[PDB]
Amino acid sequence: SAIKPDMKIKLRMEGNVNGHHFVIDGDGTGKPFEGKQSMDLEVKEGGPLPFAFDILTTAFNRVFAKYPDNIQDYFKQSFPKGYSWERSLTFEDGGICNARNDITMEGDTFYNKVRFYGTNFPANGPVMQKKTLKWEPSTEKMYVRDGVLTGDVETALLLEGNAHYRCDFRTTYKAKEKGVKLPGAHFVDHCIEILSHDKDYNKVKLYEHAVAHSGLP
């Protein structure tokens, strides 16, 4: 295996939401075989961010997912050359984002070149008013569409005052190496949480646990 039980993560995100430019750096560690990762995120430019930090967090690597022997692990077989993804996020009030990640590996470290573009968020809505609390736990449906591995998520952010703000994500995943074999259809369960933050979310500790399964217990 190219992938060790303990891997480092290095990340830089550049992006723009509703006109607002920002740069965020990440440093972390994870256990690819246990499906667990944590990282320290630091806003380097454009802080304090004028929108809910939560919209960014699923952009901050499906290599960190526990895959059973009976599902093909496209992500771990992508290394060492790596893979990219592209994602469209569609929010219920017309907010739309496009995100991408190019993931590479050097020794014990995943490098992530992340881009995040958001537009059409209403000024009075929960994202620009900073009313989000968290992502609910989600299930990603993985399947092949016109020869491309595709993940669909139908999920929600919990808001202040017992309300939910619905989001649909579609992600396409592509290995850099031609002829990494596509998996069969399956599921990946996700739990993402902010573990700590400072006053304006200039520094955030992020955690994700993910487990691949076939729909049975």
Say how many domains are in the chain.
Answer: 1
For residue 68, is the peptide bond before it cis, meaning its omega torsion is within 30 degrees of 0? no
Q: Give the whole-angstrom CA distance, residue 117 versus residue 161.
A: 28
- B/e letters for 155-187, b = 16+ CB within 10 Å, e = fewer, are bbbbbeeeeebebebebbbebeeeebeebeebb
| Technique that determined the structure | X-ray
The residues facing 111 across adjacent strands are: 10, 104
Q: Phi, psi (5° rounding) for residue 107?
A: 55, -115
Resolution of this structure in Å: 1.8
Q: Phi, psi (5° rounding) for residue 77?
A: -75, -10
Under 8 Å between Cβ of 205 and 38: yes
Report the helix count and the strand count for the chain, using DSSP H and E. Answer: 2, 12
Residue 115's domain spans which residues?
A: 1-217
